[PDB]
Every structure is written in C-alpha cells, then in structure tokens.
C-alpha cells in the first residue's frame, strides 16, 4: 500500500517531537511548601524527575507532587538511565516582603536528601549560615521579583549520572548510592514562608543508555464516557 504524505507542519509550525524540547518544558516538584528558619534550610536533590519521584497508592505521603510519574518528562526519563549537563530551576516565593531568601548550590558530596533539614543536628544556624560559608549563591528578593531561574551545573566525577534505581530505599553500597544526584540546592529563609519549585533541562543537557518501556498500568477508560451515551 501507499505510504502517503505526512501531516507534520499541516496545522502549525510548532513541532514538539524532539526529546530535549520535551525535557526543557518545566515540571512542578513542590507545591506550596513551608520554609522553617529554625533549620538550615530546604534541600533539593539535583536530579531530573523519574520513577524515583513516583507516588504510589497507599505509601508514605512525601512533600513531592503526586502526578510527577505521569508527567511526559518523567516518562522520557524512564527510557534513559544516563544523563549529563546543567539543569535549570524556577523558584517562586509566596510573599511580598523585603526579607531575602538565599539560594546556595552544593556540589556532589555523596549524600542524597530533600525537604527541610538540620545539618549535623545543631540548635542554631543564624550565626553560622550555610549561604555565607563560601559556596556559590544567589539571593531572591520577594519585594522586587519573587521568582528566579538558577542553573545548577554538572559538578561531579562521573561521565554520566544515574537517573533511577530498581529500589529507592535499598541500603546498598554508599558510594554508588550518591550517583542518583550531582549535589543539592539549598533554600534559606528569614521567617516561616511558603514557596514552590519547578525543574527543567538546561541548554546543555543529554540523555543516553536507552532501556525502552518498562511494565506499566492504566485505568483511564473507567473515568470517561464513550461517544455512544
């Protein structure tokens, strides 16, 4: 039979078939989360969204967004295990006030954490701030512009980073445990205040080591009418 003529560019000149262009569209990580000034600050693991961040029915409720697994970006990252390059985060403060919020990069150390957390279980962090230690930082001012677009670099020892593992909570060898991330981002407030975090790929980003589609499940049929009443 005849192969026919393609329909690419018939409707409009907005082609979305590229892999990177899908990955460059941002995804919501944390929706309306609290910042506590009692702790060091909120920690974000530097990794793209994948089956690692996938919510399950009746598990422990994390601070993450639930539908991250069902996003297109995570679906593409469930085909490739290797990735390299910078990433871009968009942070939004839920405030108008003058009290600034310092965002500080941490390179690849080894650990893999998230959320609000104390460093080394102290009871004071104002006199000894993480943002004034020496690491690279950029501050947010809500009164001027409550959003920001930082670009975390790829500072590690590996040619590629591990996207996902077969089990997230498995206590295997600790040196290979840390290859899921390339460090962390640190958010440090002044007062208790809400924020939201978005993730997207950098201009310089690459994926490889293609595995193909894993075992899936759906039930979308059940939540819609047919066109025959």
């Amino acid at each position: 039979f005849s192969d026919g003529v393609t329909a690419m560019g018939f409707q409009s000149l907005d082609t979305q078939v590229s892999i990177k262009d899908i990955l460059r569209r941002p995804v919501l990580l944390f929706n309306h989360v609290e910042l506590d000034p009692d702790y060091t600050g909120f920690f974000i693991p530097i990794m793209p969204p994948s089956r690692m961040m996938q919510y399950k029915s009746g598990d422990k409720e994390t601070s993450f967004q639930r539908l991250i697994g069902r996003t297109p970006q995570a679906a593409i990252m469930n085909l490739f295990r290797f990735w390299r390059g910078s990433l871009r985060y968009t942070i939004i403060i839920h405030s108008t006030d003058g009290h600034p919020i310092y965002v500080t990069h941490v390179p690849h150390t080894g650990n893999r954490v998230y959320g609000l957390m104390k460093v080394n279980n102290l009871h004071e962090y104002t006199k000894v701030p993480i943002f004034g230690c020496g690491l690279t930082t950029e501050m947010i001012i809500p009164s001027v512009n409550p959003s920001i677009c930082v670009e975390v670099p790829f500072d590690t020892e590996n040619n590629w980073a591990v996207t996902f593992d077969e089990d997230a909570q498995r206590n295997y060898s600790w040196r290979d445990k840390g290859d899921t991330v390339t460090g962390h981002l640190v958010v440090t407030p002044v007062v208790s205040v809400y924020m939201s975090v978005w993730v997207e790929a950098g201009d310089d980003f690459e994926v490889s080591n293609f595995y193909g589609p894993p075992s899936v499940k759906t039930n979308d049929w059940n939540y819609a009418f047919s066109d025959e009443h």
Binding site: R81, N159, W160, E166, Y172, S173, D176, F210
Partner: protein, 199 residues
C-alpha cells in the same frame, strides 16, 4: 578521551589471550518455558571470572590489573531438529547495577540491542557489546583489603529469554540446547599490581 586522562600510565592489550573465542556452561531450552522467563543472565565480566570459564587463558590478565575497558562479542549457537519451532531473544543492558528488576521484559529486550534466535533453522547470533559505564573504568576484582563502596566486575548484563515458547511434534525431542561463546575485541588494562585468585 577518558582513557588517557584517568590513567597516567598507558594501558596494555593482550590480543593473543583476549581475541580468541571461549565457551561457557550450556543453556537447556525446554518446552516447559513460558514467555518472559530467563534461560540465563550474566553480569560481565564477573560471570566469566568466578562461575563460568575460571581456568580460561582469556582470564589470565584479570589477576594482576585493577582497571580496564571491555568491548566484547558473544556468538550463540542453537541446535534443534526441523520438526520443532520456537523463538529465543538475547539482549544486553549497559550499567545494569541496581537495575535488573526493571526494564527486564522481552519488550525491553526488543528495545535494547539484541539478537533473535530461531530454534528450527539453527542460526547463530553475534552481540557486539561495547563499553558504556558511568565512570572511566570498571574495577576488576574484589579484595578483602579493598573498599566496600564500589561493586566491581559489573558494567553490563546479558539476558537470555523465551520470546515465544518451544513447540515440538508427535514423539519429538522435549528439549534442545544453546551453547554461548564470547571473546574480547578491545580490552585495555590500567593499574598493574600483585596477582590474586579470581574471586
């Protein structure tokens, strides 16, 4: 690129020892096999060190060196009579450490680079398996004085699976066998040290 920088000393090849073929223990393929069930699976080059082909001459350089890069080929041979029919797929998965449970399906086997063996025609299959690991080198041997942070001898996994079950005729042979071969096409070695027994 990563070879010359990561190793101050130049790496060595042993073409006479490496480029030769080497068999391992066989694979029994029964009529009792269902779809997506493993005939075999291998963590290269560890399952060519410890379990299968211990006293092979291919395993001579792996005593002394502690790092290396590994491009392999793996020829598989099927032998069944003309009154049978069945499909066996064999794929490869690069850097499969803590990723053996998932993307392990015959679908993932089709998606990843693979070979497709018919059990009636008795064809052979050649898996060109290059080196794709998340470091410059893979560590060769475990040791009782070495660190327990890095898991050595696993940069890829082989997966031998039923694609479609073996069927036979009336009073036919209830099973047939597959013999796997392997060889090293590019084996570079860094970090010379005192020799040890292989696992």
């Amino acid at each position: 690129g990563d070879l010359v920088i990561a190793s101050s000393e130049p790496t060595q090849q042993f073409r006479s020892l490496t480029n030769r073929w080497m068999p391992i223990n066989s694979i029994r393929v029964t009529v009792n096999g269902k779809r997506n069930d493993l005939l075999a699976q291998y963590y290269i080059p560890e399952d060519f060190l410890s379990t299968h082909a211990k006293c092979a001459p291919n395993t001579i350089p792996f005593e002394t060196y502690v790092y290396g890069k590994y491009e392999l080929e793996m020829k598989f041979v099927a032998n069944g009579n003309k009154f049978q029919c069945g499909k066996v797929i064999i794929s490869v998965k690069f850097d499969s450490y803590q990723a053996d449970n998932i993307n392990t399906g015959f679908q993932a086997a089709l998606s990843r680079p693979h070979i497709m063996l018919d059990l009636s025609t008795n064809n052979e299959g050649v898996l060109k398996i290059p080196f794709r690991y998340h470091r410059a080198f893979v560590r060769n041997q475990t040791h009782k004085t070495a660190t327990a942070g890095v898991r050595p001898g696993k940069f890829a996994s082989i997966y031998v699976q039923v694609l479609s079950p073996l069927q036979t005729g009336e009073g036919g042979a209830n099973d047939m066998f597959i013999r796997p071969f392997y060889r090293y096409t590019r084996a570079e070695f860094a970090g010379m040290s005192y020799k040890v027994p292989l696992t």
